[PDB]
Ligand binder design. Structure first.
Ligand SMILES: CC[C@]1(c2ccccc2)CCN(c2cc(C)n(C)c(=O)c2)C1
Lengths: 215, 215
């Protein structure tokens, strides 16, 4: 899904430092010194802030520093300011002159206390089952920062199709909410023994499970 | 000063063609064949669609064609589809290891087909009832445009407290999704005959009802 592997999210308080990694393979990150980093504020055009692992373009403050160790490049942002809040991407040229990209890391300069998400997993409703639909819904609410990743598990294996997750939105309590729904057929829901929703936030994971109970 | 000049906006209806420009100088755009184009749906990672002025990466349909003349690069999107509604950025390499990005062009696919919402109401799960929670979720999906008003009913009376509704987010099917959830105590859920979710989209209203059952 993402050639280079970046953490989905990172965070720190104003004035602190935060380090985000960009892990590849021997033929890209560790094989050359062409790792770049890009910063994109929400709704803005991206900006190159690091090239050739460590070089800072003109106008990029020294608070941003890049390095590499093996197959993993790292960007460090010291003296975090609210302006540094943005999405950070890495890229690296490969062996056959192909450019590879990381998935991005959402960096949040905490503007309020951190809050873990409340998760509720709902099994199929009777009405939708009689309409040949067995959609599960994983409700996620009351979390901050608003970065979250969701993973569904049929029995114990990961599902890689039919998952949808809404963009997190601020609610009345100034915390974020979102929902992930898995569009299962009534057969899929009955054939397997249980489905699970896995939610990851600020590095920690929570998992709820549901199973057919003949109702 | 580092800024390629793109048109702020472009629009067109399905099946139409659209061309957007990326004007630089003789040192960046007109000084090499390193012009790239990136597509980005809001709230999502971008995708490189053109590199070296005209090359499409694998997976990019030939509906997207790039060109260059003087210091002005142009991207053309023929046969506009709903999934082409997004932001588009150009970039070009400049001397001094500089990578210049344009301001970005929001392409709007006009007159996309209206679609009524699929409404699925979920009663409290067996787990959250043990945990003394009785939250209901009204999953609303597959509707366009992304405007909906939600109303909740207890039996026949309106519900005025404990209602939250996420902001509709566009999903992979190019239609919107959202979840309205009602926070009830188990006593509220078991003391009423039914709760209803009323979703209104484009003057038309759908209603779903659930009631306490053995489940
Ligand atoms: C070089 C500019 C990039 C940018 C950033 C923000 C908006 C638009 C473009 C940086 C990340 N970037 C990607 C990233 C990913 C994951 N992919 C798959 C790409 O094809 C391209 C291109």
């Amino acid at each position: 899904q993402s050639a280079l592997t970046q953490p989905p999210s990172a965070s720190g308080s104003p004035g602190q430092s935060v380090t985000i990694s960009c892990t590849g393979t021997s033929s890209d990150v560790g094989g050359s010194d062409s790792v770049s980093w890009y910063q994109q504020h929400p709704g803005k055009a991206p900006k190159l802030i690091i090239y050739e692992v460590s070089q800072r373009p003109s106008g990029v403050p020294n608070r941003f520093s890049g390095s590499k160790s093996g197959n993993t490049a790292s960007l460090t942002v010291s003296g975090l300011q609210a302006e540094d809040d943005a999405d950070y991407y890495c890229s690296s040229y490969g062996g056959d002159n192909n450019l590879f990209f990381g998935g991005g890391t959402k960096v949040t300069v905490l503007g309020q206390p951190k809050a873990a998400p409340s998760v509720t997993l709902f099994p199929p409703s009777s009405e939708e089952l009689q309409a040949n639909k067995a959609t599960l819904v994983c409700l996620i609410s009351d979390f901050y920062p608003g970065a979250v990743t969701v993973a569904w598990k049929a029995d114990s294996s990961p599902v890689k199709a039919g998952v949808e997750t809404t963009t997190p939105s601020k609610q009345s309590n100034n915390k974020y909410a979102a929902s992930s729904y898995l569009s299962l057929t009534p057969e899929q829901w009955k054939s397997h023994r249980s489905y699970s929703c896995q939610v990851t936030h600020e590095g920690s994971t929570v998992e709820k499970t549901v199973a057919p109970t003949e109702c």
